[PDB]
Design a protein around this ligand. Sequence first.
Ligand SMILES: N[C@@H](CCCC(=O)N[C@@H](CCS)C(=O)O)C(=O)O
Ligand SMILES: [Fe+3]
Length: 329
Amino acid sequence: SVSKANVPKIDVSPLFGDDQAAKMRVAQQIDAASRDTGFFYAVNHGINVQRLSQKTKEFHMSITPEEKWDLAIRAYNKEHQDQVRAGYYLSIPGKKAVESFCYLNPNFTPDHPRIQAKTPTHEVNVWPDETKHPGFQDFAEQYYWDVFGLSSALLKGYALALGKEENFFARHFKPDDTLASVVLIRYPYLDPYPEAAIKTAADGTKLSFEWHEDVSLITVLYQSNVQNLQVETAAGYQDIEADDTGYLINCGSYMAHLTNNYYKAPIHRVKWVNAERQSLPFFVNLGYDSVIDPFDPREPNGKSDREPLSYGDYLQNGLVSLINKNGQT
Ligand SMILES: N[C@@H](CCCC(=O)N[C@@H](CCS)C(=O)O)C(=O)O
Ligand SMILES: [Fe+3]
C-alpha cells in the first residue's frame, strides 16, 4: 500500500502579528515544507471552518435542478456566454459525479473597470435567489474576505521564506483586483457509483481527478475529514492525511515559475472515495497585470533564465490547459 506524505502542521498565527522573529520561524517551516512534499497544514488560522462547512452543506443539499441550470457556466448552458469561470458546474448522473459552484472577487461588479472592458478572466458572480438560500450570498462573500485575509498572511510567510520583504507577493494581492476564486465542490455518495465517473491511474488507483499542478500562486484548501488526496514524490504517490481543522496549503505553477522551480508546484491527484464530502479550495491569484520578475533563490546572484509572465496571461492559458488535460469539471 501507499506511504503517508510528510505534511507538517505549521502554526501560522505569528503571520497576523508584529513579532518579526516569530514570523521568520514560521517562514522557515514554510520553506522546509515547500522544498519537501510541497504541502503543509496551516493551523491556528482564525477561520471558523465548521460554520463554513455547515453553510456550504445547507447550499449543496438544497439547491434544485432548476436553479443549477439557471446558474450554470457556459459549458452546460449555451445561454450564459459570459460565464466561463463563475457559476454552477453540473454533475452528469451516470457519468460525472462531482458538482461545484465557483465564485470570484465580490468587487467585480458591473461598474468595475475590468468588467466594463470585458477583460478575460473577470466576471460578475451569479447567485441563487435570496428567498431560497437565505444568507448564502452574504456568508459566501464574507468567506471570500476571511480566506483572502488568511492568504495574505500566508503570502507574507512565503515572501520571508524566499529571502524577500514581507509584502513581496501581498502587494500584488489586492481586494480591488484579485483574480482569486472560491470553489464549493460536492463529492457525492452514490450507490451504485457509476464506473464511468471513476478514472483509473496508471498504477491502478481509482481517481475522481487525475494528476495536475494547480493554476494558482498558492492554493488554500478546506476539506472534509475523509482522506483522498495524493502527492507525487520521489518515492511515488503518497497519501496526504485529512485534517478538517486546518487548511491544506500548496504552491501552484506561478510560484514554480517565479522561483525557477525552487518551490515546485507539487503534482497531486484526488482518489475516488464513495463518500458525501466537501472540498472548498481558494485559488490565490494576483491581478490581471501583476508581474513579478522571476528569480532563483539557489543562485548567488538570484538571476533566472525565465521570462516575466503577467498573471492574467498565466491564468487564461492555465485554465484552458487544465480543462484540455483533465476535462471539464
Ligand atoms: N474554476 C476555477 C479553477 C478551478 C481549477 C480546477 O479545476 N482545479 C482542479 C483540477 C482537477 S482536474 C483541482 O485543483 O483539483 C477558477 O476559474 O478559478
Ligand atoms: Fe489541485
